[PDB]
Amino acid sequence: FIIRRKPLFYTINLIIPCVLITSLAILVFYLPSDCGEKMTLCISVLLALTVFLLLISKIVPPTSLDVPLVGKYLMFTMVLVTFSIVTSVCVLNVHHRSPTTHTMAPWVKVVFLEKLPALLFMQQP
Amino acid sequence: FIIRRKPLFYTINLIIPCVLITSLAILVFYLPSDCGEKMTLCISVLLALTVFLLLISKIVPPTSLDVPLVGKYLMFTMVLVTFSIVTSVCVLNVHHRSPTTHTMAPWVKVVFLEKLPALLFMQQPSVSEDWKYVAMVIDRLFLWIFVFVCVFGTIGMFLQP
Ligand SMILES: [Ca+2]
Ligand code: NA
């Protein structure tokens, strides 16, 4: 019995929400550190991805023979979002530094204030 | 009937999310107190660990003969995260102290502003800023403690596979 699933229903109800949630995984790096909302954003994205992964596993259970590509994508994005949480913690720590508590090494200057911005087309005013 | 489980499904569905969540259990101590988001992170980690523990409880039989090693690790991590929440509350309280409202004892000076920073390799480069530095020394101290206590946690989890 060769049968071919009609994919519109699951497309609409699973793939589009998953794509929408995944698209938000990168916005934490454009959010300014002064807003005080980076952690909320990345943690919410991770929670949504985890819930979607568990639901997918309930619908189509992954197995050693084959893992759904959608589940694999969700897991990869979950790992990326955890990495983004770590990176945002580090960036927030760097942002809230003052001469009264930290001293900037000369190499930090020559790299981050001079060279790296040039590669990224930033040009500190 | 000696049967062996194929662990891929539960690996993907419980282990990887659990380790991903646990890897965030020590970040609260590297988070500046001015970001105003230590509580968010630590509370989120605690609740995520609790949810996964409850899911595991729903999977395994409700028998009291033995405890899953993964459940044991989750319980240990939740205890650690609760300790970290308490420590973060204390550090936040310390950070927001000012000369008008609090007076800093001489022993607090000689300890936190002089001795401990040397031990932790901090090297301090107005009085309100001293309170802020004390809070930064306290959570640096616990960052070392949790790393050692957590890194030795892998020993417990390295005997399961
Ligand atoms: Ca806020
Ligand atoms: Na919530």
Contacts of the segment B125-128: beta carbons below 8 A, 24+ positions apart:
B125/A99, B125/A100, B125/A101, B125/A102, B125/A103, B127/B98, B127/B99, B128/B97, B128/B98, B128/B99
Residue type, A107: W
Residue A1 lies in a domain: no
Residue A2 lies in a domain: no
Q: Report whether A68 contacts B6 (CB < 8 A).
A: no
Report chain B residues whose CB lies below 8 A from the CB of A92: 31-32, 35, 37
Question: For the purposes of burial, counting CB atoms within 10 Å of the CB of A65, is it exposed (0-12), middle (13-18) or buried (19 or more)?
Answer: exposed
Count structural domains, chain A: 1
Give residues with Cβ within 8 angstroms of A53, minimum separation 6.
A71, A74, A75, A78, B12, B13, B17
Nearest chain A CA: its distance from B155 CA (Å)? 23
Residue B147 lies in a domain: yes
- Note down the domain range covering B27: 7-161
Strand ranges inside A1-125, DSSP E: none
Question: For the purposes of burial, counting CB atoms within 10 Å of the CB of B157, is it exposed (0-12), middle (13-18) or buried (19 or more)?
Answer: middle
Nearest chain B CA: its distance from A102 CA (Å)? 6
B128 touches chain A (CB under 8 A): no
A57 and B12 in contact by Cβ < 8 A? Answer: yes
Residue B47 lies in a domain: yes
Report chain B residues whose CB lies below 8 A from the CB of A40: 37, 40
Residue A61 lies in a domain: yes
B27 and A101 in contact by Cβ < 8 A? Answer: no
Residue type, B121: F
Ligand 1 centre and the CA of A35: distance in Å?
8
Residue B24 lies in a domain: yes
Entry resolution (Å): 2.9
A contact test, residue of B23, B37, B45, B130 with most A CBs within 10 A:
B37
Q: Is residue B5 helix, strand or coil?
A: coil
Which residues are registered as beta bridge partners of A66?
Answer: A63
Nearest chain B CA: its distance from A58 CA (Å)? 10
Residue B58 lies in a domain: yes
Residue B69 lies in a domain: yes
Q: Determined by which method?
A: cryo-EM
Count of alpha carbons within 13 angstroms of residue A47, beta-carbon side: 13
